Amino acid sequence: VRPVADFSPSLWGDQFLSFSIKNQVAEKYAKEIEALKEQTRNMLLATGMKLADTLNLIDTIERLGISYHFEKEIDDILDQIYNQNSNCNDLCTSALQFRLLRQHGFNISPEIFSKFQDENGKFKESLASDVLGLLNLYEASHVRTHADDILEDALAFSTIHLESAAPHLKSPLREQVTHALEQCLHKGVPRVETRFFISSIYDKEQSKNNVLLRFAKLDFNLLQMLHKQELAQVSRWWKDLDFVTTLPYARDRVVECYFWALGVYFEPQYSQARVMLVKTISMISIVDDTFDAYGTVKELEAYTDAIQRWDINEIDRLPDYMKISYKAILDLYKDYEKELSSAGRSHIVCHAIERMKEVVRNYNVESTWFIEGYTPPVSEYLSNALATTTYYYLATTSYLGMKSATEQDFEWLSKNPKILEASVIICRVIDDTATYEVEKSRGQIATGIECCMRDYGISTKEAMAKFQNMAETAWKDINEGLLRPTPVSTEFLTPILNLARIVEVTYIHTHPEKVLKPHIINLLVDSIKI
Numbered sequence: 001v002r003p004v005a006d007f008s009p010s011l012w013g014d015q016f017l018s019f020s021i022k023n024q025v026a027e028k029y030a031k032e033i034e035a036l037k038e039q040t041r042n043m044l045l046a047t048g049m050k051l052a053d054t055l056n057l058i059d060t061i062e063r064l065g066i067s068y069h070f071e072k073e074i075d076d077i078l079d080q081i082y083n084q085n086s087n088c089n090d091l092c093t094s095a096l097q098f099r100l101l102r103q104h105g106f107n108i109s110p111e112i113f114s115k116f117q118d119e120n121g122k123f124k125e126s127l128a129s130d131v132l133g134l135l136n137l138y139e140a141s142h143v144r145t146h147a148d149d150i151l152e153d154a155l156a157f158s159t160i161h162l163e164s165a166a167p168h169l170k171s172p173l174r175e176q177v178t179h180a181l182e183q184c185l186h187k188g189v190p191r192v193e194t195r196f197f198i199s200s201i202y203d204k205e206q207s208k209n210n211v212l213l214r215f216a217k218l219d220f221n222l223l224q225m226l227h228k229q230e231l232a233q234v235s236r237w238w239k240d241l242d243f244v245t246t247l248p249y250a251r252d253r254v255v256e257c258y259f260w261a262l263g264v265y266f267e268p269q270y271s272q273a274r275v276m277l278v279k280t281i282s283m284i285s286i287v288d289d290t291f292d293a294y295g296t297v298k299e300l301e302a303y304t305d306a307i308q309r310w311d312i313n314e315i316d317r318l319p320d321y322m323k324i325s326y327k328a329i330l331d332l333y334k335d336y337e338k339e340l341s342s343a344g345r346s347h348i349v350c351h352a353i354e355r356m357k358e359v360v361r362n363y364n365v366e367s368t369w370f371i372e373g374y375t376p377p378v379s380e381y382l383s384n385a386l387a388t389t390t391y392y393y394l395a396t397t398s399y400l401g402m403k404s405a406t407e408q409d410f411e412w413l414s415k416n417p418k419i420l421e422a423s424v425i426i427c428r429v430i431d432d433t434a435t436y437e438v439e440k441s442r443g444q445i446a447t448g449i450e451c452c453m454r455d456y457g458i459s460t461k462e463a464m465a466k467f468q469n470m471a472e473t474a475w476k477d478i479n480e481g482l483l484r485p486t487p488v489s490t491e492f493l494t495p496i497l498n499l500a501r502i503v504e505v506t507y508i509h510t511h512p513e514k515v516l517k518p519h520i521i522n523l524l525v526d527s528i529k530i
């Protein structure tokens with residue numbers, strides 16, 4: 001006597017099911033991009049260029065979403081800028097220099113902001129009329145670490161004056177400022193912010209560089225073609241599983257899952273990774289629905305068991321419907337091994353597998369707590385709820401497709417590094433805040449905010465505030481974990497960073513779909529008009 005599958009159908013239909021790439025256009029773009037790519041490189045390798053202009057060039061190339069073509073050129077430049085400790089006496093260039101360096105790992109000192117502060121250690125209110133300065137200070141305030149108390153007030157300071165000046169600014173600056181106030185650059189999904197910058201800002205910029213803009217538009221549209229194919233291939237794979245009918249309780253959200261994967265990494269070199277990642281997200285999506293929307297305490301107990309043993313032989317031990325899920329799961333991981341066979345990497349799949357078992361264990365626990373009406377203290381709660389975010393698992397899963405991933409990297413990840421923990425906390429803490437009303441007005445009395453309220457004996461307001469600071473602390477920890485020397489290559493940190501970004505974008509508020517729909521249309525449907 002299970003509950004009624006109230007979930008909603010995919011508003012996408014087969015819109016993505018079949019996509020065929022016009023090879024002519026694709027090659028036309030490719031050929032010109034190569035040319036524009038080289039012209040751009042020469043813009044970077046140019047000499048006798050001022051600091052402010054050099055930083056603006058790098059900032060622009062990054063916002064245009066094409067900096068992944070110049071990881072080395074950009075690096076060398078920021079490196080020398082870091083080492084020359086040059087001091088441009090104005091907020092705007094300082095804040096921009098600060099941010100760019102920190103996002104790239106260079107631990108530049110926040111002492112660069114003192115000249116802009118009074119002896120009391122607070123920003124000179126006289127700066128309130130320098131909109132560009134405030135904007136870059138604003139963006140910079142989001143990349144601070146625990147050691148940057150000098151910037152403790154930058155955010156509120158820049159925020160209040162930007163809101164103040166916004167209405168009377170010209171375009172596209174006005175739109176740019178308003179957009180930053182709603183979404184800072186450092187915590188947004190790269191593709192999303194890049195789509196917005198190219199279309200709503202740089203394209204309306206009078207001073208815009210025609211070469212860069214064209215480069216940016218063609219590159220974004222060319223990569224979109226690859227993305228669309230991937231989503232096509234993944235949509236078919238999902239179709240050839242037919243869970244939409246066999247497992248009616250499970251909701252169809254592959255398109256949204258793919259968006260998530262695209263948020264982790266968008267570059268072409270990570271095409272295989274993305275496809276693997278999205279299949280896992282979709283797959284684990286079912287397991288979730290299975291646990292808190294269809295299975296019985298006894299069936300879930302059996303399910304968690306079979307997952308731990310992980311062997312086809314356990315099938316018969318499971319109910320009929322759970323047989324579909326279980327076999328599908330083992331095959332998926334069997335496919336992963338096959339794809340990695342070609343490069344003798346099938347031996348890493350087990351890391352993702354162990355992380356999945358962990359997610360299952362905790363789902364099962366979450367169920368037991370639900371059934372018993374148990375409300376654990378914050379400490380015990382997080383000990384279980386952190387893994388149920390699925391973040392340790394997705395981060396691990398994101399390495400599977402990365403050619404450069406080695407055992408040492410997974411090794412490092414298995415020890416739950418700070419940066420990963422912070423990304424996981426952010427996801428848990430924000431989901432909890434956003435989903436407190438629901439669930440409450442439902443059984444789940446073990447929700448984070450509830451435990452927090454009972455544990456500390458504080459109101460919902462205060463509990464959400466406490467969770468808010470956990471997320472704040474978490475972001476600072478992430479920014480810290482990006483500073484050189486990094487425990488692993490930066491290439492393996494970005495996915496963790498991006499998982500945290502996705503959380504911020506998906507809950508910038510209602511249901512995720514209504515939040516993701518726009519982004520999905522903007523990244524996988526409408527191309528940027530040239």
Ligand SMILES: CC(C)=CCC/C(C)=C/CC/C(C)=C(\F)COP(=O)(O)OP(=O)(O)O
Nearest residue numbers: 257260281284285288292388389390427431
């Ligand atoms: C915000 C979070 C937690 C995850 C985002 C990344 C995704 C899509 C992971 C796959 C599993 C999952 C939690 C869902 F599909 C959504 O279910 P739902 O979130 O309603 O299930 P619960 O987290 O409440 O059990």
Ligand SMILES: [Mg+2]
Nearest residue numbers: 288289291292
């Ligand atoms: Mg769930």
Ligand SMILES: [Mg+2]
Nearest residue numbers: 288291292363
């Ligand atoms: Mg659940």
Ligand SMILES: [Mg+2]
Nearest residue numbers: 431432435439
């Ligand atoms: Mg929730």
